[PDB]
Ligand binder design. Structure first.
Ligand SMILES: Cc1cc2nc3c(=O)[nH]c(=O)nc-3n(C[C@H](O)[C@H](O)[C@H](O)COP(=O)(O)O)c2cc1C
Ligand SMILES: Cc1cc2nc3c(=O)[nH]c(=O)nc-3n(C[C@H](O)[C@H](O)[C@H](O)COP(=O)(O)O)c2cc1C
Ligand code: NI
Lengths: 210, 207
């Protein structure tokens, strides 16, 4: 129970949003799949698991994403570029996600139908804006987990919103039901060349106790 | 760090209940928030604010706004995670040290401020709100992992009436109420298995 805070504190202190990446650091599907096993364990509303990742390793495709990413060269120099997607229709998979509860005899048919109905109606009652909010919220929780996993694995990342979402969707053939919530580059940054961390507001300027 | 973080992640479970007799202090929370401060945020604008409720009557008010959920009152504290829809307005203040300490000249500083401000202004109100949710949600995940690392359990929650919460806590309409997070110590023997998880090859595609 005893040393988890100090380890985590070091991980968090060492994580810097990359401004550059270095060549000669290829990343493999195996490297990434280890990070994604941790991402799978992120919390998500109603366990709907809203988040999808399109992970681009192909250098020609990365070159082609540069214009879409507001000209940011780090898309090219990165080892991989991830598009973090949120399903605006995530709630439609409630019936499938919850089905094992029925098969394992944890819920009976009525209870399972009720649970699916609670989740679906929560979303449908609130409407389209809420569905999109949920896409952004749940994918962003997931993205933070991705970045800390990457850091733990010894990789650098830069989260990015400086891109044309529509262009990215056309280039990568992403369906309409997915919001492009963020882009994350991953790779190895030269540490000697890093600027110091940007100014942070003190805790007493962003937390109110009541 | 991978073995330790893997352990932390694997352990972390959204709490269904909280035990009595585990008060949390400002000192405890401030330790967590120091890590939260180091989360990334777009343009380093630091969009997120936390309203941290220890007062038991306010928790009762919040419970009424959250479908009567008992964990609101049995929690050691209830946090409201806010995102500032007007965060971009503080660019000039946040970047000011770069100029004053001579890292940037005035032209470069003005250019930096204008780049951030115009990015938000040119996109518009829906974007500002999207940014409030996105950056606050990144922050919330950091908060939950920080709490885990400190030995606390949390439950993220969206099952509440946001307008009722803003009335209870006197929250300006400039802030989006992004999430509620309860914190405390869970009865760990009282724990259902982790809800089914999609395999990685069902949520990741490579190109
Ligand atoms: C949602 C979001 C969007 C971002 N977009 C970009 C971007 O498009 N390009 C970029 O270079 N950095 C981007 N960043 C990185 C921020 O500038 C960075 O997190 C901030 O300056 C703090 O740096 P640090 O994370 O190293 O402390 C983004 C960060 C966030 C979380
Ligand atoms: C944004 C979002 C909203 C949530 N809202 C609630 C809620 O209002 N009430 C609740 O009991 N749990 C809530 N949760 C918890 C989820 O049901 C939980 O994360 C999921 O079932 C998986 O459990 P696990 O995180 O322990 O693996 C929420 C989770 C997410 C991230
Ligand atoms: Ni542990």
């Amino acid at each position: 129970h005893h040393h988890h805070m100090a380890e985590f504190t070091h991980l968090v202190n060492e994580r810097r949003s990359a401004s550059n990446f270095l060549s000669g650091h290829p990343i493999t599907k195996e490297d990434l799949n280890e990070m994604f096993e941790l991402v799978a364990l992120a919390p998500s509303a109603f366990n709907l698991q809203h988040t999808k990742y399109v992970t681009v390793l192909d250098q020609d495709v990365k070159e082609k994403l540069k214009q879409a990413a507001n000209g940011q060269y780090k898309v090219v120099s990165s080892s991989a570029v991830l598009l973090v997607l949120g399903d605006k229709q995530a709630y439609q998979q409630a019936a499938d996600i919850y089905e094992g509860l029925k098969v394992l005899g944890i819920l009976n048919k009525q209870e399972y139908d009720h649970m699916v109905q609670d989740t679906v109606s929560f979303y449908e009652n609130r409407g389209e804006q809420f569905k999109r909010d949920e896409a952004i919220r749940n994918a962003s929780l997931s993205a933070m987990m991705f970045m800390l996993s990457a850091a733990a694995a010894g990789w650098d990342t830069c989260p990015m919103i400086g891109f044309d979402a529509e262009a990215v969707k056309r280039i990568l053939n992403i369906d309409d039901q997915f919001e492009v919530v963020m882009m994350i580059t991953i790779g190895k940054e030269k540490t000697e060349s890093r600027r110091p961390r940007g100014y942070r507001k003190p805790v007493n300027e962003f937390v109110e106790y009541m």
